[PDB]
Design a protein around this motif. Structure first.
Motif, PDB file in Angstrom:
ATOM      1  N   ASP A  76      33.780 -27.896   2.721  1.00  0.00           N
ATOM      2  CA  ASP A  76      34.177 -27.073   3.860  1.00  0.00           C
ATOM      3  C   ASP A  76      33.598 -25.667   3.763  1.00  0.00           C
ATOM      4  O   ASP A  76      33.282 -25.057   4.791  1.00  0.00           O
ATOM      5  CB  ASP A  76      35.703 -26.986   3.969  1.00  0.00           C
ATOM      6  CG  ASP A  76      36.326 -28.213   4.612  1.00  0.00           C
ATOM      7  OD1 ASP A  76      37.376 -28.674   4.112  1.00  0.00           O
ATOM      8  OD2 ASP A  76      35.771 -28.721   5.612  1.00  0.00           O
ATOM      9  N   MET A  77      33.435 -25.145   2.547  1.00  0.00           N
ATOM     10  CA  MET A  77      33.109 -23.734   2.361  1.00  0.00           C
ATOM     11  C   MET A  77      31.653 -23.387   2.644  1.00  0.00           C
ATOM     12  O   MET A  77      31.324 -22.197   2.681  1.00  0.00           O
ATOM     13  CB  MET A  77      33.453 -23.285   0.937  1.00  0.00           C
ATOM     14  CG  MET A  77      34.937 -23.121   0.679  1.00  0.00           C
ATOM     15  SD  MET A  77      35.326 -21.740  -0.416  1.00  0.00           S
ATOM     16  CE  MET A  77      37.003 -22.152  -0.897  1.00  0.00           C
ATOM     17  N   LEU A  78      30.772 -24.372   2.833  1.00  0.00           N
ATOM     18  CA  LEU A  78      29.378 -24.052   3.126  1.00  0.00           C
ATOM     19  C   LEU A  78      29.241 -23.426   4.509  1.00  0.00           C
ATOM     20  O   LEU A  78      28.554 -22.411   4.679  1.00  0.00           O
ATOM     21  CB  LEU A  78      28.511 -25.310   3.004  1.00  0.00           C
ATOM     22  CG  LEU A  78      26.981 -25.175   3.086  1.00  0.00           C
ATOM     23  CD1 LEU A  78      26.463 -25.303   4.519  1.00  0.00           C
ATOM     24  CD2 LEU A  78      26.506 -23.868   2.456  1.00  0.00           C
ATOM     25  N   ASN A  79      29.888 -24.019   5.511  1.00  0.00           N
ATOM     26  CA  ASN A  79      29.873 -23.490   6.875  1.00  0.00           C
ATOM     27  C   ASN A  79      31.164 -23.902   7.566  1.00  0.00           C
ATOM     28  O   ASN A  79      31.190 -24.835   8.376  1.00  0.00           O
ATOM     29  CB  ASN A  79      28.654 -23.989   7.651  1.00  0.00           C
ATOM     30  CG  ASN A  79      28.419 -23.207   8.929  1.00  0.00           C
ATOM     31  OD1 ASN A  79      28.753 -22.024   9.019  1.00  0.00           O
ATOM     32  ND2 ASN A  79      27.838 -23.866   9.927  1.00  0.00           N
ATOM     33  N   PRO A  80      32.268 -23.230   7.257  1.00  0.00           N
ATOM     34  CA  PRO A  80      33.563 -23.651   7.797  1.00  0.00           C
ATOM     35  C   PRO A  80      33.812 -23.124   9.200  1.00  0.00           C
ATOM     36  O   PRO A  80      33.417 -22.010   9.552  1.00  0.00           O
ATOM     37  CB  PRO A  80      34.565 -23.046   6.804  1.00  0.00           C
ATOM     38  CG  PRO A  80      33.866 -21.808   6.289  1.00  0.00           C
ATOM     39  CD  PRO A  80      32.391 -22.134   6.279  1.00  0.00           C
TER      40      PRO A  80
ATOM     41  N   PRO B 122      26.144 -11.738  -5.618  1.00  0.00           N
ATOM     42  CA  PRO B 122      25.210 -12.111  -6.699  1.00  0.00           C
ATOM     43  C   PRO B 122      24.958 -11.033  -7.747  1.00  0.00           C
ATOM     44  O   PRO B 122      24.652 -11.381  -8.895  1.00  0.00           O
ATOM     45  CB  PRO B 122      23.927 -12.460  -5.934  1.00  0.00           C
ATOM     46  CG  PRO B 122      24.423 -12.986  -4.627  1.00  0.00           C
ATOM     47  CD  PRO B 122      25.624 -12.121  -4.293  1.00  0.00           C
ATOM     48  N   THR B 123      25.057  -9.745  -7.404  1.00  0.00           N
ATOM     49  CA  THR B 123      24.885  -8.686  -8.393  1.00  0.00           C
ATOM     50  C   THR B 123      26.120  -8.479  -9.259  1.00  0.00           C
ATOM     51  O   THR B 123      26.118  -7.583 -10.109  1.00  0.00           O
ATOM     52  CB  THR B 123      24.524  -7.353  -7.719  1.00  0.00           C
ATOM     53  OG1 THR B 123      25.479  -7.054  -6.689  1.00  0.00           O
ATOM     54  CG2 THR B 123      23.117  -7.411  -7.120  1.00  0.00           C
TER      55      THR B 123
ATOM     56  N   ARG C 142      32.382 -17.379   3.396  1.00  0.00           N
ATOM     57  CA  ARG C 142      31.765 -18.670   3.135  1.00  0.00           C
ATOM     58  C   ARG C 142      30.736 -18.513   2.021  1.00  0.00           C
ATOM     59  O   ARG C 142      30.253 -17.410   1.758  1.00  0.00           O
ATOM     60  CB  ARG C 142      31.115 -19.253   4.402  1.00  0.00           C
ATOM     61  CG  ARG C 142      30.134 -18.340   5.122  1.00  0.00           C
ATOM     62  CD  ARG C 142      29.556 -19.066   6.346  1.00  0.00           C
ATOM     63  NE  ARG C 142      28.362 -18.413   6.882  1.00  0.00           N
ATOM     64  CZ  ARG C 142      28.352 -17.598   7.933  1.00  0.00           C
ATOM     65  NH1 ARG C 142      29.477 -17.329   8.585  1.00  0.00           N
ATOM     66  NH2 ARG C 142      27.213 -17.050   8.333  1.00  0.00           N
ATOM     67  N   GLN C 143      30.415 -19.630   1.358  1.00  0.00           N
ATOM     68  CA  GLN C 143      29.400 -19.668   0.296  1.00  0.00           C
ATOM     69  C   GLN C 143      28.005 -19.683   0.911  1.00  0.00           C
ATOM     70  O   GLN C 143      27.458 -20.742   1.229  1.00  0.00           O
ATOM     71  CB  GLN C 143      29.577 -20.898  -0.587  1.00  0.00           C
ATOM     72  CG  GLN C 143      30.895 -21.023  -1.300  1.00  0.00           C
ATOM     73  CD  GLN C 143      30.958 -20.192  -2.568  1.00  0.00           C
ATOM     74  OE1 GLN C 143      31.999 -20.091  -3.226  1.00  0.00           O
ATOM     75  NE2 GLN C 143      29.841 -19.585  -2.908  1.00  0.00           N
ATOM     76  N   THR C 144      27.411 -18.507   1.072  1.00  0.00           N
ATOM     77  CA  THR C 144      26.043 -18.389   1.577  1.00  0.00           C
ATOM     78  C   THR C 144      25.314 -17.344   0.733  1.00  0.00           C
ATOM     79  O   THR C 144      25.727 -17.007  -0.382  1.00  0.00           O
ATOM     80  CB  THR C 144      26.023 -18.042   3.075  1.00  0.00           C
ATOM     81  OG1 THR C 144      26.705 -16.798   3.290  1.00  0.00           O
ATOM     82  CG2 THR C 144      26.691 -19.135   3.890  1.00  0.00           C
ATOM     83  N   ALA C 145      24.216 -16.804   1.274  1.00  0.00           N
ATOM     84  CA  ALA C 145      23.353 -15.901   0.519  1.00  0.00           C
ATOM     85  C   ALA C 145      23.555 -14.441   0.908  1.00  0.00           C
ATOM     86  O   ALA C 145      22.628 -13.794   1.404  1.00  0.00           O
ATOM     87  CB  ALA C 145      21.886 -16.298   0.707  1.00  0.00           C
ATOM     88  N   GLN C 146      24.746 -13.901   0.676  1.00  0.00           N
ATOM     89  CA  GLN C 146      25.020 -12.515   1.024  1.00  0.00           C
ATOM     90  C   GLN C 146      24.683 -11.594  -0.137  1.00  0.00           C
ATOM     91  O   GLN C 146      24.784 -11.971  -1.305  1.00  0.00           O
ATOM     92  CB  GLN C 146      26.485 -12.339   1.408  1.00  0.00           C
ATOM     93  CG  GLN C 146      27.123 -13.636   1.788  1.00  0.00           C
ATOM     94  CD  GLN C 146      28.498 -13.463   2.358  1.00  0.00           C
ATOM     95  OE1 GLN C 146      28.768 -12.500   3.076  1.00  0.00           O
ATOM     96  NE2 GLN C 146      29.378 -14.406   2.056  1.00  0.00           N
ATOM     97  N   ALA C 147      24.289 -10.368   0.195  1.00  0.00           N
ATOM     98  CA  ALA C 147      23.983  -9.378  -0.823  1.00  0.00           C
ATOM     99  C   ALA C 147      24.505  -8.022  -0.381  1.00  0.00           C
ATOM    100  O   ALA C 147      24.605  -7.736   0.817  1.00  0.00           O
ATOM    101  CB  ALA C 147      22.476  -9.306  -1.093  1.00  0.00           C
ATOM    102  N   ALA C 148      24.830  -7.186  -1.363  1.00  0.00           N
ATOM    103  CA  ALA C 148      25.261  -5.829  -1.067  1.00  0.00           C
ATOM    104  C   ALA C 148      24.069  -5.000  -0.610  1.00  0.00           C
ATOM    105  O   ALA C 148      22.945  -5.194  -1.079  1.00  0.00           O
ATOM    106  CB  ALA C 148      25.911  -5.199  -2.298  1.00  0.00           C
TER     107      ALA C 148
END
Ligand SMILES: *[C@H](O)[C@H](C[C@@H]1CCNC1=O)NC(=O)[C@H](CC1CC1)NC(=O)OCc1ccccc1
Ligand SMILES: *[C@H](O)[C@H](C[C@@H]1CCNC1=O)NC(=O)[C@H](CC1CC1)NC(=O)OCc1ccccc1
Lengths: 303, 303
Positions: B48-52, B168-169, B188-194
């Motif tokens: 569910d957490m990939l794209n809920p 990720p950091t 959600r579990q995606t590719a976010q960055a600060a």
């Protein structure tokens, strides 16, 4: 992940803090069952504190000289006695919030949480290490005496420190909860000073392991050294000697990272000789020595 | 005297922490009156957490899908709803330990205490600053979601943060207690960055004032500068611009030390251009920016 200096949750101790008043002096006390513990210098006046005879001063007190307040509710004192530098006031009510507790004395290099309090009211919480010279680097203002230090282990509070005074260099001194000072200090206003201090080597190594677990690897190298050779470098830079027992307690961190203790000692040697060259480790530009192996494992096992 | 990073006493918040279980996910919730607040991603499975779509996922839940435990005592859920990224579970018992509280959103540069919790049980307390890029530098492991951040003002708890995720950091992101994220992040579990961060100038100046109050004076000089000239140096070193309002809030510290803000800015300019040359300020070899003027005044007024 992340590594932060972290105190124990303070709620169990907050429920034990009271205000103790004697004469014009007000400080904090610790209320456990039907006994309140506080620094005995609460019974002193300004001139008493230059060279007090505490046996005389306590003989001249009676129960009604002590005002104890648990918030608004005043507690009735029904007895008083001295144990070394702590005053024990027996009260007519057992604290309903008394946690499971122990009185323990800690060793230099070990850490504990301080609940800073004023007028019986907690104001802040922070971690302290007992320095090799038996002082702590705290944050204490007037009225903070009687604030305590503690560790918590499965809802059991181990009290290890009660605050008594500030030394001329700005560091702090106090007793265990049996009233015995940490270090060669006494509870009077005289000319005391802290002795020379040293760096806690096992803690620096533990913090380097925390750094690796959190992705700081720039200080690592391929070299290994021997215990005897490392201890020669430790003396030059005023670091404590590394014992085999210290190597053993660093075992879990060594296993988690795959870096032998003597491997990490080579890194510390290089850091001591070369410095950081503008880089940081876990947000610091100095080698940190106030985290125990236990402190590190608590935050880094899940990583 | 002494200056230590210090958290608020955590007892009032400890009495509000519960464990919330949904499916095979267990995290922490905040129990205030008859409502439990927790991250809505507790209702998600691994896939569910990939794209809920959280509206769909909550429609497919019922009250009996939620296990709430206040210690051993299980709490019965009688309703459920969503407010942005927080789930609200109505329970059949008002928390008898509910403090006076507010939900407030804080500004970058402001600080708060984090009560780290696992399985509904508090484990540690520490201070965090909200970075200009809307992350915090925390210490959070699996199971820490639902831990909250707060400030306390005369027995009123202002909740400002609920923990949701790690970037990720290694820094951390979350929401206010209305469920609105700090920063451009999503649950959600995606590719976010600060985003890029900057140094909080008013806080560095406040910490320099704390240093002077505690006897660190080596970085002071006879020079004064102007606001415009200082702000040119701030841009070069990735520091926030100094406003007149910031100068005004540093007024009390300026008065206590007799050092004008623009006088201290000249010192900061020199530290930025020359470094420390092997010296330390309040035990640090870097310029610290996570203490607010309020944080400093709290510990340094009595000195
Ligand atoms: C007790 O509340 C107080 C705590 C001091 C006050 C300032 N910071 C502290 O930690 N203790 C004392 O005042 C003791 C009493 C003597 C031990 C019997 N004296 C003391 O600390 O003197 C040093 C000092 C330094 C700065 C300000 C006041 C006092
Ligand atoms: C909730 O308990 C958890 C907190 C993380 C776990 C490790 N440190 C934390 O702060 N949050 C998550 O697992 C979130 C869930 C998504 C937001 C919906 N995901 C996440 O943080 O992924 C990054 C990550 C990093 C390291 C280890 C696990 C997960």
């Amino acid at each position: 992940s992340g590594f932060r200096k972290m105190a124990f949750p303070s709620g169990k101790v907050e429920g034990c803090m009271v205000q103790v008043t004697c004469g014009t002096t007000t400080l904090n006390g610790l209320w456990l069952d039907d006994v309140v513990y506080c620094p005995r210098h609460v019974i002193c006046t300004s001139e008493d504190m230059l060279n007090p005879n505490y046996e005389d001063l306590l003989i001249r007190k009676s129960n009604h000289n002590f005002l104890v307040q648990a918030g608004n509710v005043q507690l009735r004192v029904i007895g008083h006695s001295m144990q070394n530098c702590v005053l024990k006031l027996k009260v007519d009510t057992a604290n309903p919030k008394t946690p499971k507790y122990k009185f323990v004395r800690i060793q230099p290099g070990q850490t504990f949480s301080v609940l800073a309090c004023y007028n019986g009211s907690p104001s802040g919480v922070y971690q302290c290490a007992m320095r090799p010279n038996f002082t702590i680097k705290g944050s204490f203002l007037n009225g903070s005496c009687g604030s305590v230090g503690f560790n918590i282990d499965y809802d059991c509070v181990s009290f290890c420190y009660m605050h008594h005074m500030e030394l001329p260099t700005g560091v702090h001194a106090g007793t265990d909860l049996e009233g015995n000072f940490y270090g060669p200090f006494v509870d009077r206003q005289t000319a005391q000073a802290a002795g020379t201090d040293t760096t806690i080597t096992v803690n620096v190594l533990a913090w380097l392991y925390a750094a690796v677990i959190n992705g700081d690897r720039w200080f690592l190298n391929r070299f290994t050294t021997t215990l005897n050779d490392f201890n020669l470098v430790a003396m030059k830079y005023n670091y404590e000697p590394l014992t085999q027992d210290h190597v053993d307690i660093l075992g879990p961190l060594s296993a988690q990272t795959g870096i032998a203790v003597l491997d990490m000692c080579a890194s510390l040697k290089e850091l001591l000789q070369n410095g950081m060259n503008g880089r940081t480790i876990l947000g610091s530009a100095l080698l940190e020595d106030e985290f125990t192996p236990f402190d590190v494992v608590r935050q880094c096992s899940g990583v």
